[model samples]
Target chain A: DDRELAILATAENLLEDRPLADISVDDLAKGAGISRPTFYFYFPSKEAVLLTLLDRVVNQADMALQTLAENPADTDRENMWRTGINVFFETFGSHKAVTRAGQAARATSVEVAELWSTFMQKWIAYTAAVIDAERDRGAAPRTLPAHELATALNLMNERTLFASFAGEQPSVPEARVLDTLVHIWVTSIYGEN
Target chain B: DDRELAILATAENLLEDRPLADISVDDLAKGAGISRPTFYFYFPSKEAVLLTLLDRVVNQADMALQTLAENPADTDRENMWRTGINVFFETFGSHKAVTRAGQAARATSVEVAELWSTFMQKWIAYTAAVIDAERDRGAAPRTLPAHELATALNLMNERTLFASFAGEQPSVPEARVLDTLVHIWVTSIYGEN
Candidate 1:
């Protein structure tokens, strides 16, 4: 079990230095002080190792959302939105390499793509429920259907963060990123008051 | 010249059937009825060919935006936003494969990344100017700085469309996509009635 965990840690550590494409299973094996055969025994392929790491990272992110959702007593919409958006910046921001790797492989890797798509649907539904509850209470205006609105907002967060993480030019500046997302969410859902 | 055009056309055709990663230079060469060396002369790599295709596609999309921006007389704010958003879907939807390929390669290919980044900067500036003009004329509410708002909105379009094209699960359904985007843009920039 330690060897399995060590392999996972090695992949994460090496990912910070370079992208997943540049990394190899041999590097992971050597880093974990195990033979290549041993690496395969524990994981079928390099991507399998990445899947495990991604599983951990995304679950951590999901839990952050879950924590906010469970606190039904917190009725401050602006503060709730800020906390929700900020936690993603903290979770994915810290695990930048893993998140980026998962994103890149999402198109090509069947398992990775399935895992990420599932995660997104979960978040979209969760956000939609929150928006619908607010609309029901008349705290926010109903614009698009709650599900569609949630889809757009969540997708916006995903793309904006990916662009920032990739160091793409003309991306949201670091300081401006969180506030910009919160601004769009609060205004789009609650109106421009 | 026909052979060169043939290669580019062949790439676009093939990309529709599969991702750029599955494509090979040999296949490109064969598709164009040229030798491998000739294929090399035309494109340094598969990505280079993709870059050329992307350049043409983005320019066409940019022109659609430029056409809207050049006409100041048509100041129905809602119509202007609808035309602007619809053009991207039309341009990008028709050339989905090239757009998707360019998007996927953006992270790894330096040239593709630079080209996409520059194009994004141009659009962001154009959108920001439109937002500023609207604010100055009291046509739209002032929220975030024009540039940041444009960045967020544009990035949302980029991701939302990419997911839809990729056929990712639980994405924006085809029929509802454009209206959903226009709703966000108008509301976030102009507020709800």
Candidate 2:
């Protein structure tokens, strides 16, 4: 029990300092104060460790999507939506290293990539359904089929946040990034929400 | 003369089949009818070959930006902008292997990553300038700086395109992805443009 937790804890600490690409199995084991061979007993690759960590918390992101699914009846939906987006951001922020690693491996494994695909698909589908409720209220041009619209917006936020947080790039602050996302989200949905 | 061209050609051809990570120097040299040692003489690593090929065409991506820098005087500016973006796509499309390699290198090498940084920053700056010209005339929320808006959208395009192209589990078609990008581009600059 301690051995596995030791590896996991050491990895989470190291992830905050370096990206998963630079992280290695030897270093991972050494940091956990175990032999390299012992490390394999727990997980196959550095990516698997991240995946295990991710699975523990994938719902953190989905919960954010869950918030979007509800029609905040009679209340200010705009602010409610903003809260949902921030929660999404917070979900990734709390685990920056894991998210960055997962983003890179997106196409590397069919299984690893599906976790993100499922997460994103849920968001887009939910976003589309929620927005569909108010589509009649504004002439938002219906520029795309609803899911495509949500897909693009969701990815726009995901990548900007990904690039910004992946470290060493001169990106704007997170708040500005979120504000721009909110602007795009509100306008894309409400025509002029 | 033919030897170098043969090597480069072989790498380009093989790259379509597999990434550099799985490709071997012996196979590359053999494909070009050269010895493995000669392959080392020509280039040190598989990454070097990919980088060399990428350097030759990094300017193609820049050419897309160059098209943006000069103001096209009223001759279907929208279509012209679309061509600019297409050229950017063509720059990557003509060499998916190298583009994918370079994209991964965006984090690894200070040398290789700069190619991406330069490409992205130019896109952001050029897009912002082009949009800034029309900003006063639109109700696009000035909640974020124009370049910041442009930055978010630009990275969004890069990451989504990168993930989709590097082999796939599942993804929308290129046309749909491009359509989503153009939609975001237009709307983010001017609400519903």
Candidate 3:
């Protein structure tokens, strides 16, 4: 487990300074103070390390959502959204390299795309469940099917995340974007102007 | 120009039988009955041939939208949506290979991605203009920004197209999926139950 952590940390460090395409297993093993053979003993390839990181990040997000569901605070819409957005940004920010690698790899590798799809499917399921709960509580409108509303929410999350990643930093203040998205989500489903 | 069309047609044909990765310039040349040097004479690489096909397909879509706009049908909400959906399916079905190649290449290649983005920018602008016209005429809602609605429409298009291409040929009628999407779009945009 320590060895796995070492490999991931080394990957994070390397990813910060270089693109995913430029990183090699030798660099990873050297950075982790492990022999190449030992690195292979722990992981098969650079992609393997990135996949492991993705799994960890996704699991953490799920755990956070579980806590949110259990606590179900009487927070306002904006506050609830802000909490979720911050958790997403902070978790991905912790391993920006891993994020970059995953984004790049998804385009090139079927395995990576499959892994990303699984993570997104989990997110969609969680979001749909949340919306269903909110609708049942009369917080959200029951005008559209909860599943379809959830699909729209998932698209918003993806579009925002991808835009944030691709565009310049300090671009479109995070709060402003989140507010706009929440407004759209509420208005679209509830027919509220 | 004839040579260029020949190469592109060959490449498109190959896509029906194999994935993009398996289709090579040599194979394309052989299929087109052209020499390797002749293939290079017409296009720089396999990617260039694919780009040309994408550009041509995008031009056709643009022309189709223009024709749709000029006709200016006075119809109910459902009829208007049905017309739009028909145009979308017909355009995409005619150029499925080029569309598939464009999607696959855009994510993997920077130059191709930039070209694809330019085409999409124009496509979105044209679609937004249509939505704005509908709102001006009271056929659609005026609450949301035209561009935001355009973005949602584009997302729906991409989701449906990818689903159709990647999944099983419909056990349920294709009409069913199209109708479901149209229902989602109409209800969400117009606040219609």
Candidate 4:
């Protein structure tokens, strides 16, 4: 367990200096104070290490979402929206590099690409649930299906993150990315006053 | 000029059969009745050939937009949107392989990637202009910024095209993808009646 922790820590530390592409088993092994072959004993490839990190992040986000879903008193529209946005940004902020690397690999590597897709699907599902709740409570429009609304919200997130990564910094803080997302959600799902 | 046309046509044909990764100069030369070395003399690499096709498509789209801009009498909102969508689909349909190659190269090759970006930017600019015109005429919502509205439209196109290419058909005709897009534009920019 300590060896596994060392490898993950080494990979995380490497993110500070160089991109995932520049990373190698030798670097990871050296950082872990182990031999090159010994590093392979723990992880098969560089991608494997990255995938492990992504798995951890996904698990953490899933647990957080579960916690939110279990809270009965937080079922109001505003509370649900705030909880969803906070969980997203908190997860994204903690795993920015992992998310970035996952995005970068989406078009290239099959293994890492699915992580982002999975995350997008989960996020969309969560949004759909919230929209359905709002619709039932008569807080949002009933014309469009919640699933379609969720798909649009997912597209907005993809657009925003891709734009941000492509050098278009949001005028708002990273935390506000979620806020803007919620704004888009409410306005798009319900008519603007 | 004849030889150049032959090369472009041949490369386009090759793109239809398989991915750019499986194509080679020899295949191009054989298809065009030229020697492999002659193919190299005409184009530095296969990517250059692909870029040439992209350039032609972009030029055609630009010319169409320019004509639309110059004709002030053709200011019908529905007509303008239909024409814009038709122009995009027609151009892309003609050079589908080149478009595929360009999409494939977007994240890998720097120069080819920029061609994709520049083309998308042109689309955004053209759509933004149309949105601005609609706003001035009180046909569109004055609430959302034209730039942001344009971005949403462009993102929809990109995402839809990508999904279609990746085999996720969204219960819509390839030709009528623009309808779904216009629906999004109308709803997001202008609330339902």
Candidate 5:
């Protein structure tokens, strides 16, 4: 348990200095104060170490997404949604190093790519679950299924969040990006809430 | 120019059977019936060859998009818009092999990724310009500017089209995917259309 967390922290910290692709397992073991075989004992590959990091960070975002879902009346609905989206942006920004590196590695590693796709499905399903509740309460369109709408909206956030985090100035206003996000979410759900 | 075109064709043709990452310069040169040194004279990397491929296919799409801008009144607004979107989809479909291969390579290569981003900006700019005309014509919203809305709509197509093209069975039904795309584009522009 201790070794696992140690390597996980080591990998995330290492991402601060270099890309996961550039950081070898041998070097990673050294960072953890261990041997190469010991590194393999806990994590199979460098990408696996990254997958663990992504899973942890994204899972935290998932928790916040679910929080919004579980308690839609936690505050004003708009405030709740905005907070949730902001948490997504902030948390993803904190780990942009891992996020960007994993994304880049996806071209060569089918497993890494599938890891992303799998998580995308999980996020979409959860987002859809929330949408289902909103649809039942009001005028969210039924023409498109809840899951598809959730997928589209969530994917929109993925690209927008990516730009906002990874770029120097984020070419668009951060407010504009969030407003577009909230606008699209409102429109997609209530056909304009 | 002939050697350039030959090397270009060789690379695009090679993508039909393998990934762009899988097809290297030497294999490309052999296909072009040229020497490696000769190939280098024309293009720096395999990705440069694919950039030429992208330029060709995307220009065809640009031509279709331009037609809508050039003669919006040539047909009814709805027909013109659908035709433009379809042409983008069709041209991209025609080059799915290269499109998919190049996209899958995006994570690993800077020039390859910058190629997509540069064109994304160009496409968003052009789409926004057309959108501004539509907004002035008393159809679209003034709340969001043309560029922001254009960026949102364009980014949506990218995610939708990537799924629609690359997978054996797209995660979302392609029919639903296209429906969602056209719906978002219309509603974002006209709030109905």
Candidate 6:
């Protein structure tokens, strides 16, 4: 556990300096204060280390949403959405190295792409669960089924964040991006609540 | 115009039989009843032909949206949204071969990807314009800025359609996809209207 943690910690630090491609296995091993063979004991390859970083970021994202779900202020629908969406933006922004690297790698690596897809499904299911709870409690109208609405909203976040990070020209100013997304989520799910 | 039409029509038919990679320059030329060299007059390559097809489909989409914007039924907000969203689903569905091929090509070809980006910007701007007009006439609420709402909503359609076309297991059943999209659009833009 100690060796694996060191390897990941070293990888995260190295990723901040350069992309995954430029950070070699030897670099990772040296940074972790371990021999190359010892690095192999924990990770199969550099991409494996990167995947671990990506998994960690996604877990944090899920946790953030879970916290919002469990919040005592859940009746404050708008605040819950704004806080939840902001957490996602901040989580991904702070972990830009892992997020960006994983995004780029997914285009070329089947394994990376599949893991990212799995992550998306997991987020959608969890979000749907929250929506289901809200609808059951009569906080949200039952216009669309919980899962369907969650899928659309979750993928909206996925595409929007990808564009934001990729530096696509913003149709709306960056300042308003968060508010607009939050507005859509709150209105679509809760409707003027 | 006759030769160009033949090339496009024949290529569209060939795409139905197989993917672009399987349908060669010779196949396009032969199907169009032209010499292989003559094919160059119409398109630089097979992907170029596919891009032209995509452009046409997108044009149809723009026209569909434009018609919605200009419709006297605009005051019938719910019907207008339902009709507008349905037109989009139908237009893209009818051009599945071209749309699917162009989508796959965009990943590898810089030219194709750039065109797709341009197309997305065009749609977002056009949708934003409609949102602006709706707000100007006091049909919709002025909660979020018009453009920002448009960007989020347009990207939702893009991501949702991509998932739909890629045959991703939808969280919502296929039958409800259109209604759900229209519901979100109506609620987001016009509230209870």
Worst 10 residues of 6 chain A by lDDT: A165-174
Say what the RMSD of model 2 is.
3.6
Instruction: List per-model TM-scores for chain B.
Output: 0.93, 0.82, 0.85, 0.87, 0.82, 0.84
Q: Which residue runs does candidate 1 get wrong by more than 4 Å?
A: B21-41
- Candidate 2 lDDT at A87 equals 74
DockQ of 1: 0.58
- Among the candidates, what TM-score does chain A have in each? 0.95, 0.82, 0.84, 0.86, 0.81, 0.82
Model 2 chain B worst lDDT run, 10 consecutive residues:
B163-172
Candidate 4 residues B96-189, lDDT tens each? 6777777777666777767777777777777777777777888776655566656655665666555544443221245445554554555655
lDDT of 6 by residue, A95-124 (tens): 877877887777567777887788788778
Per-residue accuracy of model 1 over B30-64 as CA lDDT, tens digit each: 99999999999878888889989999999999988
**Model 5: per-residue Cα lDDT over A44-93, one tens digit each:** 89878887787787788778766666663543544555676777777787
**What local lDDT does model 1 show for residue A134?**
89
Clashing pairs in 2: none
Where does the lowest 10-residue lDDT sum fall in candidate 3 chain B?
A: B166-175
Candidate 4 local Cα displacement, residue A171, angstroms? 10
**Candidate 2, B55-121: lDDT as tens digits:** 8778877865676556554455446456666666677777787777777676557778876677667
Top-lDDT structure, candidate number: 1
Model 5 chain A — which ten-residue stretch has the worst lDDT? Answer: A166-175
Which residue ranges in model 6 land beyond 4 Å of their true spot? A1-50, A67-73, A104-108, A170-172, B1-42, B71-73
Question: Candidates' DockQ values?
Answer: 0.58, 0.41, 0.17, 0.23, 0.37, 0.42
lDDT of 4 at A93: 66
The per-residue C-alpha lDDT of model 4 at residue B103 equals 75
Grade the docking of candidate 3.
incorrect
Positional deviation of A44 in candidate 5, in angstroms? 3.4
Q: For residues B38-85, could you state the per-residue lDDT of candidate 6 as single tens digits?
A: 999879988888888888888888888777766675567777767877
Misplaced by over 4 Å in model 4 are A70-86, A129-138, A142-146, A166-180, B69-86, B132-145, B168-176
Note the Cα lDDT for every prediction shown.
Answer: 0.86, 0.72, 0.67, 0.68, 0.72, 0.79
Q: Per-residue alpha-carbon lDDT of model 2 for A1-193, expressed as tens digits?
A: 8988888888888888887777889988999999998999999888888887777557777865565556444357567567778877888888887777677676576666788778777777777776776565553455567776776777777777776676535465675767878877776666531
Rank the candidate models, highest TM-score first: 1, 5, 2, 4, 6, 3
